[PDB]
């Protein structure tokens, strides 16, 4: 019932479940935290910005890797108007045989990609599932830099 | 071990084990005292 809202002693003394709920919803309101100065505020915001950019780059790297690994980017290059892009494969134990058959695309059940990443990456000059892997590797390196 | 075994190795791992340990840690942390 203590020590969770480390940034707020008023919440940490709450004997109810409201402390847990308000601890989540006030975690990023740095200006309202206990023992707070402006320098610490700007420094924490700066570090949070770095972590956020790292998260964005990791998300993009994950999209690239999953298109390279479980997608049909190379097949879509040769026939972009008939082949439907694949986002990533599906492994869900709750599937029946009918669901597996219906979601089956090429070798495994997979989700069609509605993000338009296939067309975007094709336009900027990507033609191989090894070009996407290089992008994922580089973006994970950039995320490490930002962290 | 082929690459197609990775989903069956990772999806249960992440989607069940990570919730369990994360719940353990979060409950322990939010139920601490001083």
């Amino acid at each position: 019932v203590y020590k969770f809202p480390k940034f707020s002693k008023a919440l940490a003394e709450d004997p109810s479940t409201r402390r847990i709920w308000y601890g989540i919803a006030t975690a990023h309101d740095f200006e309202s935290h206990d023992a707070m100065t402006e320098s610490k505020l700007y420094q924490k915001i700066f570090a949070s910005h770095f972590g956020h950019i790292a998260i964005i780059f990791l998300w993009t790297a994950g999209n690239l890797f999953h298109v390279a690994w479980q997608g049909n980017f190379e097949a879509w290059i040769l026939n972009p108007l008939k082949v439907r892009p694949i986002a990533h494969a599906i492994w869900d134990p709750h599937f029946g045989q009918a669901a597996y058959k219906a979601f089956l695309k090429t070798s495994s059940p997979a989700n069609l990609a509605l993000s338009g990443v296939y067309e975007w990456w094709y336009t900027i000059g990507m033609r191989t599932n090894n070009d996407l892997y290089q992008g994922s590797f580089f973006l994970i390196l950039l995320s490490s830099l930002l962290l | 071990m082929s690459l197609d075994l990775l989903p069956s190795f990772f999806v249960p791992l992440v989607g069940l084990v990570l919730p369990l340990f994360s719940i353990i840690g979060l409950f322990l942390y939010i139920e601490k005292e001083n």
Binding site: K6, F50, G51, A54, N129, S144 | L3, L6
Partner: peptide, 30 residues
């Protein structure tokens, strides 16, 4: 089709990015 080595080293590099993330997470304090 990417190889096992390609996926494995990407997983290893992802682990390194994870240790860098907790270091940033712990440095942003409890």
């Amino acid at each position: 089709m990417i190889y096992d080595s390609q996926v494995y080293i990407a997983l290893v590099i992802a682990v390194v990015a994870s240790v860098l993330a907790i270091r940033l997470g712990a440095t942003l304090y409890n």
